[PDB]
Amino acid sequence: MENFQKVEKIGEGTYGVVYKARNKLTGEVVALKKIRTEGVPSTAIREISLLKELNHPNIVKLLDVIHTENKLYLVFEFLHQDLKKFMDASALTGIPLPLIKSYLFQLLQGLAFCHSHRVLHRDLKPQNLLINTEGAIKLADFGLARAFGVPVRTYTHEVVTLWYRAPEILLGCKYYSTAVDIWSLGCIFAEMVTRRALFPGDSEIDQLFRIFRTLGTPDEVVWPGVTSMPDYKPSFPKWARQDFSKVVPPLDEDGRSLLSQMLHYDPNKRISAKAALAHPFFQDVTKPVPHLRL
Ligand SMILES: Nc1nc(N)nc(-c2cc(Cl)ccc2O)n1
DSSP, X not given: OTTBOOOEEEEEETTEEEEEEEBTTTOXXXXXXXXXXXXXXXXXXXXHHHGGGOOOTTBOOEEEEEEETTEEEEEEEOOSEEHHHHHHHTTTTOOOHHHHHHHHHHHHHHHHHHHHTTOOOSOOOGGGXXXXXXXXXEEXXXXXXXHTOOOSSSSSSOOOOOTTOOHHHHTTOSSOOTHHHHHHXXXXXXXXXXXXXXXXXXXXXXHHHHHHHHHOOOOTTTSTTGGGSTTOOTTSOOOOOOOHHHHSTTOOHHHHXXXXXXXXXXXXTSOOHHXXXXXXXXXXXXXXXXXXXX
16 A cells, blocks of 8 residues: 555565564554455454454454455554574574573463464464564464464465474364464464474475374374364374484473473363463573574
């Protein structure tokens, strides 16, 4: 629109491109996300519009939802850096454990809030976690899959990230629960610690098998009902579980314990965001300021 002075294209999301823009009249700098374009479910605009009510320190504020020329634009408060960029910038030294701990605590607070309001993210990844100079971290792009439905790609020949997808999704479950966000966050937690993606699959089956090779091929003992899932194949190789100590070295036992609960196969056994906040790992949590190069 002509209401802005578009600073630059910010990035490509699963549901659309994001832009940094300034209001010509108010001068406020915001993030503008453009969704796909033959109509779009109107029941979805209602659901998305409801998200404007969400207010929490760890959720990026949704300022406006605009429907024009059959396009959907989401106007969000702007943050200067995403966690993927920050992790890449911190690859030589690594993110200090106290900062990793602070970020995980805040993200769980954000998820606990959304989940208590029956809002799921469903596509959590480093790219949609944003940080500022004051040590805060916030989740952006909640509830798009629930309102619109996860399509095939972003909008134009894009390589979707499968790395943070929960096993029940990869196995074809039709109904998702808030547990899918805890899984994604667990994967991100591991990544901040080791400075390498935990399950970097290059295909849906490679994604699934990388999880199996690490946590062990699931069975009815650890995950009742798994052999009945839509995409389950009795022909899946049976890999034995690896020690966690090999998974995220050199994370201490409190951290490893918490991560293992975030990565349980059974969505029912997987820890909730609220319960995770009470885990001993957070007994000494603080709020460090990051070294951000903007
Ligand atoms: N990649 C990237 N980088 C920056 N600096 N900001 C964003 C961003 C994305 C959304 Cl959806 C909402 C607000 C934002 O600030 N995304």
